Design a protein around this ligand. Sequence first.
Ligand SMILES: CCCCCCCC/C=C\CCCCCCCC(=O)O[C@H](COC(=O)CCCCCCCCCCCCCCC)COP(=O)(O)OC[C@@H](O)CO
Ligand SMILES: CCCCCCCCCCCC(=O)OC[C@H](COP(=O)([O-])O)OC(=O)CCCCCCCCCCC
Ligand SMILES: CC(C)CCC[C@@H](C)[C@H]1CC[C@H]2[C@@H]3CC=C4C[C@@H](O)CC[C@]4(C)[C@H]3CC[C@]12C
Ligand SMILES: CCCCCCCCCCCCCCCC(=O)O
Ligand SMILES: CCCCCCCCCC
Ligand SMILES: CCCCCCCCCC
Ligand SMILES: [Cl-]
Lengths: 193, 33, 51
Amino acid sequence: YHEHYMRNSRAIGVLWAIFTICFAIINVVVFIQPYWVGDSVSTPKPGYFGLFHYCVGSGLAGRELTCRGSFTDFSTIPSSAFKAAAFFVLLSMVLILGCITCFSLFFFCNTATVYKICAWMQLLAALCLVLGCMIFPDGWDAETIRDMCGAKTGKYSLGDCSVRWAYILAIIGILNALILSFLAFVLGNRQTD
Amino acid sequence: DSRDYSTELSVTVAVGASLLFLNILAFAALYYK
Amino acid sequence: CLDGKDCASFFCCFEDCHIRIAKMDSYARIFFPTAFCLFNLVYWVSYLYLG
Ligand SMILES: CCCCCCCC/C=C\CCCCCCCC(=O)O[C@H](COC(=O)CCCCCCCCCCCCCCC)COP(=O)(O)OC[C@@H](O)CO
Ligand SMILES: CCCCCCCCCCCC(=O)OC[C@H](COP(=O)([O-])O)OC(=O)CCCCCCCCCCC
Ligand SMILES: CC(C)CCC[C@@H](C)[C@H]1CC[C@H]2[C@@H]3CC=C4C[C@@H](O)CC[C@]4(C)[C@H]3CC[C@]12C
Ligand SMILES: CCCCCCCCCCCCCCCC(=O)O
Ligand SMILES: CCCCCCCCCC
Ligand SMILES: CCCCCCCCCC
Ligand SMILES: [Cl-]
């Protein structure tokens, strides 16, 4: 029974590491790509906006997407809520990359201790992502977002614009991060047996 | 460009469901004593 | 309390912990290159491909 126990624990640990890497990839992708919200058929102008970057059309029956915004210059970010959401998603990315670094501790430190360390780090990343996703809709009152979407758009209200793949992927990232946090906790308490 | 995002959200939700199902299978393998 | 373990023991670490402080060189030897490699990977990928 003990060898099956060890084999299952090792396999589930490897799978947990793989899914942690996948969630880190997801976190990086949702942080970078500006496809959180986007235009619709009834929108006055086309385009999209992410956490800090955003592209908007000129409005002459073509693409002509003028793009502006950069996290390395907070002056270009439309709103303080957008700044806070971008900062929180960045903090979540830093935390999950910190766990991926802490994978190295398995050589030396106790396996249960390392599992608990990444359990707490992944949980904190999940809270950071949750805070970012709650704070990001707060900034839809900004003048640029109102110009892009319409007058009906407002705080905590899509209006004419629609959620795109990055926002729902961030929600999926929250779910995956919380799940991996509990998985790490159970693995850490399982290694001691 | 058609400004309809249906297949995009569908594939995103499908990939997310696959990942989440794998992690729930991880919980299953753990909690199955 | 599905385990019924005390939550602080189940989740947190009051057991043992620091004591393992002399091995910080051994930890750093692997930690710092890994952190730098991860930083370089994310940085270059983000600036070259994703944006
Ligand atoms: C693009 C980004 C790529 C991500 C790159 C991530 C790489 C980051 C750097 C180093 C990883 C270090 C992993 C080393 C794990 C080595 C673990 C090991 O040696 O085997 C045993 C099992 O451990 C365990 O179950 C823990 C298992 C750890 C699993 C983590 C390593 C798997 C990485 C698989 C790569 C997948 C990539 C695919 C991405 C698409 C523990 O030993 P041991 O009993 O003697 O100790 C007992 C104690 O008394 C003293 O250590
Ligand atoms: C230039 C690179 C040189 C690599 C040399 C590889 C030697 C590998 C042998 C295994 C490591 C080992 O057991 O000895 C060194 C230390 C532990 O030493 P000790 O004081 O416990 O006896 O082990 C450690 O505590 C940390 C070992 C880290 C090895 C290298 C990590 C990757 C570095 C990336 C360089 C870019
Ligand atoms: C120390 C280890 C564990 C974590 C390292 C985290 C690294 C990968 C983080 C920290 C700060 C991050 C950067 C912060 C801001 C920006 C601007 C954005 O427009 C592109 C991504 C970019 C350039 C980020 C890339 C990833 C980054 C460099
Ligand atoms: C010894 C390990 C070091 C790990 C860090 C390696 C980072 C090297 C980066 C060198 C500059 C890369 C420039 C790339 C330009 C390009 O992609 O076209
Ligand atoms: C294919 C997109 C790759 C984005 C970078 C992923 C980095 C994962 C953490 C090192
Ligand atoms: C075990 C105590 C470690 C204290 C580290 C202090 C770091 C100071 C950074 C300014
Ligand atoms: Cl930027």
